[PDB]
Amino acid sequence: PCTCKYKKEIEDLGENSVPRFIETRNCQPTCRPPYICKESLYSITILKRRETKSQESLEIPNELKYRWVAESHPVSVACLCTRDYQ
Amino acid sequence: AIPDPPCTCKYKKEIEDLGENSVPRFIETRNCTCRPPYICKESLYSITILKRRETKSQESLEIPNELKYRWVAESHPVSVACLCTRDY
Amino acid sequence: VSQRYPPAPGLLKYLEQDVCYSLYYYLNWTSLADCKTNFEETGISDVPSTVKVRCQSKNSIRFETEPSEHWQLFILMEHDNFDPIPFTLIEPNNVFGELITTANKEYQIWSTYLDEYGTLQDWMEGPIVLYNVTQEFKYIILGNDSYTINGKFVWNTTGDRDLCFDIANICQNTNMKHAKIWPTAHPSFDVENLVLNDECEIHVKGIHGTTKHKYKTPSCFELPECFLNNMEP
Amino acid sequence: VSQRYPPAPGLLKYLEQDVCYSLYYYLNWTSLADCKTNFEETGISDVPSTVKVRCQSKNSIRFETEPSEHWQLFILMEHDNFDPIPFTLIEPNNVFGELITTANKEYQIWSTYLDEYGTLQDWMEGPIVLYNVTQEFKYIILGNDSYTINGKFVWNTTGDRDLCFDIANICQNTNMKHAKIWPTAHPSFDVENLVLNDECEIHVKGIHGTTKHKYKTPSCFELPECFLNNMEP
Ligand SMILES: *[C@@H]1O[C@H](CO)[C@@H](O[C@@H]2O[C@H](CO)[C@@H](O)[C@H](O)[C@H]2NC(C)=O)[C@H](O)[C@H]1NC(C)=O
Ligand SMILES: *[C@@H]1O[C@H](CO)[C@@H](O[C@@H]2O[C@H](CO)[C@@H](O)[C@H](O)[C@H]2NC(C)=O)[C@H](O)[C@H]1NC(C)=O
């Protein structure tokens, strides 16, 4: 009806990440103007590993892990067709 | 020029705690005109969460062997969008 | 009568990696090997610990210490002593700390001051371990090329003094923000990157449980500096 | 001439938590203290290690060992040795293992057989560390109340020796599935929970790089067992 068909894709992020392969749903026409197809960004957390005091690992109160490192990762997870914020 | 309310189905954000035992503690959940035959669905998306010592370390999908025995990665589907796809 | 749970070096021996890393990466040593932290060579003094339990949830404990120039190590001690020992390392000058709990068990807190090299002085005996907040909020709009909204949140406290809090906040068009409030006279929570006419929600976890609190960010005509510095229908 | 990097007990001493934990929950000891894992009391034998490097990525190494009734510990040794030491614990009877690399550095593998409690016998000196795949696929429909599609995937290999692979697969109406293929004579990747007329994609990472491979699951008329046991034109 008023929706955009989306395409699935894979993000490798290297083997150093615990969640290596990530699912990304991009925007790949209906829902003609004033609405236009945007990609809904969603932030997921990935667990990488040992580096030289790089940035600040997302809060994981350091006990067992600085051997590993938490990082935020925004990714397309849907293709919305809302007119809000263009 | 612009109509209101818009065609897009409403989506509401919520937080999933999953306890402090989860490495990703706080999870973002986006739950739910466009009358039938279509109905607003909640777009399920699978994310990975790690479990702690208390578990017998059940079957992980795939994690480095440095993180066996004590930790286990498990899939977690969560609503991440609201879309007007019909049933069946 | 209550019991006591002395430190177990045979198990505490395994926290050396943690303690040595947390100091190796902080003090920036030439190597890790120069960490002379030894739990099996450490003793126990008559000195009672100055630690004080300020808060505890059924999955954690939050305590206060006196400000020390040195690092401070803290552990929770049980009778059985089979599982790895819960512990926490308080950075110097800082005074508040937290210890996580596993299952419903009695523990005893034990504290230590760490050397420059990570030498543990003798353990000090500590203490034993075993309806809806209403929120007010204020917003301030700020101008910098574009405009940004900062929102400050506050809520009332019970008669008791010993209260810590856990805060979670989310909006329809702003990424999630979470925080942990140590015990204060009056708690307060700041929020940034907010926008106009956004339907937000904030959860406040406290001694009296969780308080979910929906709220909407004000419009431009509600914010004088917004309305004035824009066109006015 | 090539170099050598002997084990460093002063640093290896800190893997005891990892080794003892990973064994405490696996072998299920009464406590943790009964581990008796000591890196500073273990020596070095004349015995050369039987390890063989089968694969290596610019951030990892995958090797094979001989099947042992006992646990096996493996480490990567550098000259400087400042960063945490890479290691891996091969469970008994299993023969394949992996060791992680972080930087472009020469390492030397060192292997050990672990006791029932994790006593390390003397280290054995190991070796030193320093175009498009074409994919075919087959499907099978299965009947039980509903219907289910299982899909098997295969691809060709170069004339090189011992190829490891990393496979990822996703479909428009099936959650992702990923796997890591150790070196075999002929690689194969299984997929389940597939559906009819689904637009899928599979990526195969190998020595020659990543190969992205789009593919569509067949229709019912294309699967005899589907067409026969369903209504037709
Ligand atoms: C903050 O003030 C409110 C205002 O009363 C308190 O809310 C009351 O909570 C009790 C239960 O604890 C109810 O019986 C009352 O009906 C509530 N008041 C109203 C007006 O509904 C709240 O308890 C206070 N919070 C703290 C932490 O002291
Ligand atoms: C699988 O077989 C194909 C079929 O030949 C190989 O593709 C060739 O790749 C080389 C590069 O190594 C090219 O120069 C040729 O032009 C390609 N030919 C064709 C027909 O595609 C492919 O290399 C093989 N893969 C492996 C891993 O051996």
Q: Is residue A39 part of a domain?
A: yes
How far, CA to CA in Å, does A27 sit from each of A4, A38, D103? Answer: 7, 7, 37
Q: Return the residue whose CA atom lies nearest to atom 11 of ligand 2.
A: D131
Whether residue D232 is found in the same domain as residue D173: yes
Question: For an interface test with A, which of B4, B28, B48, B49 has the most A Cβ atoms less than 10 Å from its Cβ?
Answer: B48
| Residue B85 DSSP symbol | P
Whether residue C140 is found in the same domain as residue C105: no
- Domain of residue C148: give its range: 131-233
Whether residue D167 is found in the same domain as residue D71: no
Distance from CA of D86 to the nearest CA of B (A): 10
* Cβ–Cβ gap B62/D180 under 8 Å: yes
Coil, strand, or helix at residue B44?
A: strand
Whether residue D2 is found in the same domain as residue D116: yes
d(CA C181, CA C164): 6
Question: For an interface test with D, which of A5, A6, A7, A10 has the most D Cβ atoms less than 10 Å from its Cβ?
Answer: A10
Any CB–CB contact under 8 A between A15 and chain C?
no
CB pairs under 8 A between B and D: 29
* The pairing of beta strand C135-144 with beta strand C52-57: unpaired
Distance from CA of C70 to the nearest CA of D (A): 23
Whether residue C68 is found in the same domain as residue C104: yes
Whether residue D97 is found in the same domain as residue D142: no
Q: Which residues pair with C4 in a beta bridge?
A: none
> How many folded domains does chain A comprise?
1
d(CA D152, CA B52): 34
Any CB–CB contact under 8 A between A36 and chain B?
no
Name every residue whose Cβ is closer than 8 Å to that of residue C97 and which is 6 or more positions away in sequence.
Answer: C62, C63, C64, C65, C72, C74, C88, C90
> How many folded domains does chain D comprise?
2
Q: Is residue B4 part of a domain?
A: no
Question: For an interface test with C, which of A43, A51, A62, A80 has the most C Cβ atoms less than 10 Å from its Cβ?
Answer: A62
* Cβ–Cβ gap B26/C203 under 8 Å: no
Whether residue C7 is found in the same domain as residue C46: yes
Nearest ligand to residue C131 Cα = 1
- Residue ending a domain, among D100, D130, D160, is D130
Given a contact cutoff of 8 angstroms between Cβ atoms, the answer to whether B15 and B27 are in contact is yes
Q: Return the residue whose CA atom lies nearest to atom 7 of ligand 1.
A: C132
* Cβ–Cβ gap C170/B28 under 8 Å: yes
- Residue ending a domain, among D65, D95, D130, is D130
- Domain of residue B15: give its range: 11-88
HEC letters along chain D: CCCCCCCCHHHHHHHHHHHHHHHHCCCCCCCCHHHCCCCCCCCEEEEECCCEEEEEECCEEEEECCCCCCCEEEEEECCCCCCCCCEEEECCCCCEEEEECCCCCCEEEEEEEECCCCCECCEEEEEEECCCCCEEEEEEEEEECEEEEEEEEEECCCCCCCCCEEEEEEECCEEEEEEEECCCCCCEEEEEEECCCCEEEEEEEECCEEEEEEEECCCCCCCHHHHHCCCCC
* Cβ–Cβ gap D25/B65 under 8 Å: no
Measure CA of the first residue to CA of the last residue in chain D; give whole Å.
75
Experimental structure resolution, Å: 2.7
HEC letters along chain C: CCCCCCCCHHHHHHHHHHHHHHHHHHHCCCCCCCCCCCCCCCCEEEEECCCEEEEEECCEEEEECCCCCCCEEEEEECCCCCCCCCEEEECCCCCEEEEECCCCCCEEEEEEEECCCCCECCEEEEEEECCCCCEEEEEEEEEECEEEEEEEEEECCCCCCCCCEEEEEEECCEEEEEEEECCCCCCEEEEEEECCCCEEEEEEEECCEEEEEEEECCCCCCCHHHHHCCCCC
In which residue are the tokens 């210490």 written? C65
Give the residue on B whose Cα is nearest the Cα of D166.
B62
* Method of structure determination: X-ray
Measure CA of the first residue to CA of the last residue in chain A; give whole Å.
21
Whether residue C125 is found in the same domain as residue C17: yes
- Both tokens of residue B75? 């899939």
Q: Is residue B6 part of a domain?
A: no
Helices D16-24 and C16-27: crossing angle in degrees, nearest 10, is 140
Given a contact cutoff of 8 angstroms between Cβ atoms, the answer to whether D193 and D174 are in contact is yes
Name every residue whose Cβ is closer than 8 Å to that of residue D37 and which is 6 or more positions away in sequence.
Answer: D16, D19, D20, D23, D114, D117, D118, D119, D120
* CA atoms D24, D25, D30, D31: torsion sign: positive
Whether residue C59 is found in the same domain as residue C26: yes
What b-and-e string marks burial along C179-207, b requiring 16 or more CB atoms within 10 Å of the CB? eebbbeeebebebeebebeeebbbbbbbe
Whether residue C29 is found in the same domain as residue C124: yes
Given a contact cutoff of 8 angstroms between Cβ atoms, the answer to whether C181 and C189 are in contact is yes
CB atoms within 10 A of CB B5: 7
Whether residue D8 is found in the same domain as residue D92: yes
Q: Return the residue whose CA atom lies nearest to atom 3 of ligand 2.
A: D134
Given a contact cutoff of 8 angstroms between Cβ atoms, the answer to whether B73 and A18 are in contact is yes
HEC letters along chain A: CCCCCCEEEEECCCCCCCCCCEEEEECCCCCCCCCCCEEEEEEEEEEEECCCCCCCCCCCCCCCCCCEEEEEEEEEEEEECCCCCC
d(CA B7, CA B38): 12
Q: Tell me whether residue B22 is exposed, middle or buried, using C-beta atoms within 10 angstroms of its C-beta: 0 to 12, 13 to 18, 19 or more.
A: middle
Q: Is residue A24 part of a domain?
A: yes
D131 CB near ligand 2 (under 6 Å): yes
Give the CA diameter of chain C. Answer: 77
Q: Is residue A1 part of a domain?
A: no
In which residue are the tokens 């937000």 written? C200
- Residue ending a domain, among C95, C130, C165, is C130
* D-contacting residues in A 27-46 (Cβ below 8 Å): none
Q: Is residue B81 part of a domain?
A: yes
Whether residue C82 is found in the same domain as residue C144: no
Q: Is residue B76 part of a domain?
A: yes
- Side chain identity at B66, as an amino acid letter? E
Return the ∠ at Cα A40 (arms to A35 and A44), rounded to 5°.
175
Cα-to-centroid distance, D167 and ligand 2 (Å)? 19
Q: Is residue B3 part of a domain?
A: no
Distance from CA of D26 to the nearest CA of C (A): 13
